[PDB]
Write a protein that binds this ligand. Structure first.
Ligand SMILES: *SC[C@H](NC(=O)CC[C@H](N)C(=O)O)C(=O)NCC(=O)O
Ligand SMILES: *SC[C@H](NC(=O)CC[C@H](N)C(=O)O)C(=O)NCC(=O)O
Lengths: 201, 201
């Protein structure tokens, strides 16, 4: 399969996941300003929504939306346990966390990246985002990973989303349980490996 | 089980779904301004995130996040086909749509409901939201429901989210394929039934 991505963006999540699954995949950069693939092709014809990540399956089908992507993957290599079996309870709490990250944290960043966002509304947005991380912090002071004890697709997404913190001037240094957790993920082989391949580290 | 909700909010989605599943459930209103249940209990102790919907399962476990909720439900009564089996492809496109609705449409409304949102940033936000509906419109001019031919948990969520349009002054009247689709859902028994129980219709 082929994962379309942009270095440092949210596609980093499924990237980290692709490695942990130890699968066969090809990646291809996307230029978000021109909406063109590094090979010079029209990206809107691949994904009308014009964002990354996007995943091309071996049968030509396209899967958009990070949370959908990381789940399709993790659900192919159960043995690695990046998820929980479907219909199971643990899984439902995982989907719940993925939705929270996608809608409350991920989308909470959006305005800090827009040029048309009133510089005055910026401190307000930041505070909203911080509170979200303060909560995640709490969750961590009791368990290893956000969705339990073992590393899951939801930890990849949270890691990716916290990488943007610096670039937007969001100090999460105080969140000790989060930091130690972040530090513990930056060490994982395939995380460090996927990070290098992207031009960071 | 007990579904915590607020009339007209996003909890309307899992409400509509609870009926379609023809299950045994009890509902309880939540006062969002005081963060108290209609019985006068502290809602933050039920859901630290302080929002609806929230679902209490028969074993006392709490499931937050709409998309997680509507999936746990639909996955209990397969025969009705409100989803697709797990691991299946159709399902993955469903989770993808649920994420889109949750993060791009649902969260796209958020600012139009905040008081601290600069009245000037408002037309900008509206336009962002409209474009999302314009896309959904396109998708509809080819298929019956958003995720295929049959009615799914994702249609309940989209219906609920379009109900807010008027209250924020968002004209989606031009979107003919969407409207006819909306009109066709407002007719469904359990939709109309769940809508009445909530004080609308
Ligand atoms: S993180 C980079 C941007 N992607 C998304 O916002 C994905 C949103 C989906 N709802 C999801 O995958 O969860 C992106 O590519 N933005 C495009 C741009 O032009 O900035
Ligand atoms: S729609 C009403 C509000 N709920 C949510 O925003 C749910 C967000 C979750 N990410 C989800 O379920 O998808 C709500 O209850 N807001 C609380 C308030 O005080 O307004």
């Amino acid at each position: 399969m082929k994962l379309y991505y942009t270095p440092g963006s949210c596609s980093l999540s499924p990237h980290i996941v692709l490695r942990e699954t130890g699968l066969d995949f090809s990646i291809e950069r996307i230029d978000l300003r021109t909406k063109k693939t590094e090979s010079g092709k029209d990206f809107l014809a691949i994904n009308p929504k014009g964002q990354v990540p996007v995943l091309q399956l071996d049968n030509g089908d396209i899967l958009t939306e990070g949370v959908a992507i990381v789940q399709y993957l993790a659900d192919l290599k159960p043995d690695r346990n990046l998820i929980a079996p479907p219909k199971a309870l643990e899984r439902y709490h995982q989907i719940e966390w993925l939705n929270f990250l996608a809608s409350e944290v991920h989308k909470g960043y959006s305005p800090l990246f827009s040029s048309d966002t009133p510089e005055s509304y910026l401190p307000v947005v930041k505070n909203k985002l911080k509170s979200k991380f303060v909560y995640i912090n709490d969750v961590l002071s009791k368990q290893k990973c956000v969705c339990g004890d073992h590393f899951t697709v939801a930890d990849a997404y949270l890691f990716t989303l916290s990488q943007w913190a610096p670039h937007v001037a969001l100090d999460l240094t105080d969140l000790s349980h989060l930091q130690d957790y972040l530090a513990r993920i930056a060490q994982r082989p395939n995380v460090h490996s996927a990070l290098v391949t992207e031009g960071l580290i």
